[PDB]
């Protein structure tokens, strides 16, 4: 009995989708992603944990007149890639970095159909930018910047209260990656983490501090 998928408007043209999964140690984990709307078309910023919630998400937008143009996954964990199988099965384009696809392949998981690399990649010119700050939460973690509304989807890289699951983390690299991210997006109005409430650019500094503290404790 999991909480239902939630879809809530965050700003003009930007929705937060929240899906839930039981993960041992944490209890039920809420996972936030975005849906970005440009001219009657929708881009998914992360997928829900499951095919079922991915279909629910897609259908909600389809029934409101939107065409699903693609999804992008911020890292390989299922909280961000759980819907790739379903989307690929509906011939909806999926994106992930080369690094993410390699970690999916290695895990016996279905890969995104489209991949990219480099420090930054424009999923949609002037509207949706993918940025790779370096390894942290995972080796492949990327963020998504919406320059018009100044909204940064930080995913699991933004960890302002504690770093969380270190199983796939690069504790030595995270402070350098977090300094770079803070430098890059200090102009953010909103910063959307995966598992906690939306905040402002202070989440970037708080994440850096947590990364430093975690390195110094290792």
Site stretch for Zn ion (CB under 5 A), options 66-74, 82-90, 97-105, 186-194: 186-194
Residue 156 binds to Zn ion (criterion: CB under 5 A): yes
Cβ closest to Zn ion, residue 19 vs residue 54 = 19
Q: Which residue is nearest to Zn ion (CB)?
A: 77
Q: Is 159 in the site for Zn ion (CB under 5 A)?
A: no
d(CA 48, CA 189): 25
Q: Which has the closest alpha carbon to 158: 188, 123, 118? A: 188
DSSP characters over 121-184: EEEETTTEEEE---SSSSTT--EEEETTTTEEEEETT--BTB----TT--TTTHHHHHHHHHHH
Confirm or reject binding of residue 208 to Zn ion (CB under 5 A).
no
142 binds Zn ion (CB under 5 A): no
Q: Residue 106 has which token pair?
A: 């290695």
Stretch that binds Zn ion, among 8-16, 39-47, 50-58, 74-82 (CB under 5 A): 74-82
Nearer Cβ to Zn ion (31/182): 31
Among 17, 32, 69, 77, the residue binding Zn ion under the rule CB under 5 A is: 77
- The three-point CA angle 83-88-89 to 5° equals 100
Q: What residues make contact with Zn ion under the rule CB under 5 A?
A: 77, 156, 194
């Amino acid at each position: 009995s999991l909480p239902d998928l939630k879809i809530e408007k965050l700003d003009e043209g930007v929705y937060v989708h929240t899906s839930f999964e039981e993960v041992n140690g944490w209890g039920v984990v809420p996972k936030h992603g975005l849906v970005v709307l440009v001219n009657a078309e929708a881009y998914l910023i992360d997928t829900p944990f499951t095919a079922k919630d991915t279909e629910k998400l897609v259908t909600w937008f389809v029934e409101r007149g939107y065409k699903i143009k693609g999804s992008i996954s911020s890292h390989f964990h299922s909280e961000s890639t759980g819907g790739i199988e379903w989307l690929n099965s509906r011939s909806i384009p999926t994106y992930a970095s080369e690094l993410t696809n390699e970690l999916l392949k290695k895990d016996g998981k279905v890969q995104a159909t489209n991949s990219f690399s480099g420090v930054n990649y424009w999923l949609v010119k002037n509207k949706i930018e993918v940025f790779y700050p370096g390894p942290g939460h995972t080796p492949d973690n990327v963020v998504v910047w919406l320059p018009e509304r100044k909204i940064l989807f930080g995913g699991c890289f933004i960890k302002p209260y504690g770093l969380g699951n270190l199983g796939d983390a690069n504790i030595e690299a995270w402070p350098k990656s977090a300094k770079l991210l803070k430098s890059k997006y200090g102009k953010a109005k909103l910063v959307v983490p995966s598992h906690s409430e939306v905040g402002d650019a202070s989440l970037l500094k708080l994440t850096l501090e947590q990364a430093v503290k975690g390195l110094n404790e290792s």
